[PDB]
Amino acid sequence: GGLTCASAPQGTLRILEGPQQSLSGSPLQPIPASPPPQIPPGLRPRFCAFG
Amino acid sequence: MIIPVRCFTCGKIVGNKWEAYLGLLQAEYTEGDALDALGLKRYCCRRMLLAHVDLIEKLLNYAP
Ligand SMILES: [Zn+2]
Known part of the structure; x- marks a missing residue:
C-alpha cells in the first residue's frame, strides 16, 4: 500500500512564454544628423569706410 | 555688471x-x-553692447 518507483519518464517538456520580433525600421532620430550652421539671408555689410 | 562707460579699444x-x-x-x-x-x-564698439551681460539687475535683488 506504499508508494513505489514507476517507469522512467520517456520525455521532458519545458514551457516558457515568449513574444516575437517586429520589422526593422531603425528610426534613428526625431530631427536627425548634425544639422549644419548656415548663412542668414542677405545679411548686408554693417560697416563702411571713411570718405 | 553695469554697462562700460567707454568702449575699451577706441x-x-x-x-x-x-x-x-x-x-x-x-x-x-x-x-x-x-x-x-x-x-x-566699427565692430569693436558693437561687441561692447552686443555681448554685455547686465548683472546689476540680479545683484539688485537681494535684501538692502
Ligand atoms: Zn570702439
Missing part, C-alpha cells in the same frame, strides 16, 4: 546707448539693425 562712449539699445530691441529690430541705429559702426 574710447567711444557707449554708456548712454544701453537703454536706447534695450528700447529698440523691444520694438522689433534685430541686434544688427539696433546697433546700426545707435551709431556703433
Whole structure:
C-alpha cells in the first residue's frame, strides 16, 4: 500500500512564454544628423569706410 | 555688471546707448539693425553692447 518507483519518464517538456520580433525600421532620430550652421539671408555689410 | 562707460579699444562712449539699445530691441529690430541705429559702426564698439551681460539687475535683488 506504499508508494513505489514507476517507469522512467520517456520525455521532458519545458514551457516558457515568449513574444516575437517586429520589422526593422531603425528610426534613428526625431530631427536627425548634425544639422549644419548656415548663412542668414542677405545679411548686408554693417560697416563702411571713411570718405 | 553695469554697462562700460567707454568702449575699451577706441574710447567711444557707449554708456548712454544701453537703454536706447534695450528700447529698440523691444520694438522689433534685430541686434544688427539696433546697433546700426545707435551709431556703433566699427565692430569693436558693437561687441561692447552686443555681448554685455547686465548683472546689476540680479545683484539688485537681494535684501538692502
Ligand atoms: Zn570702439
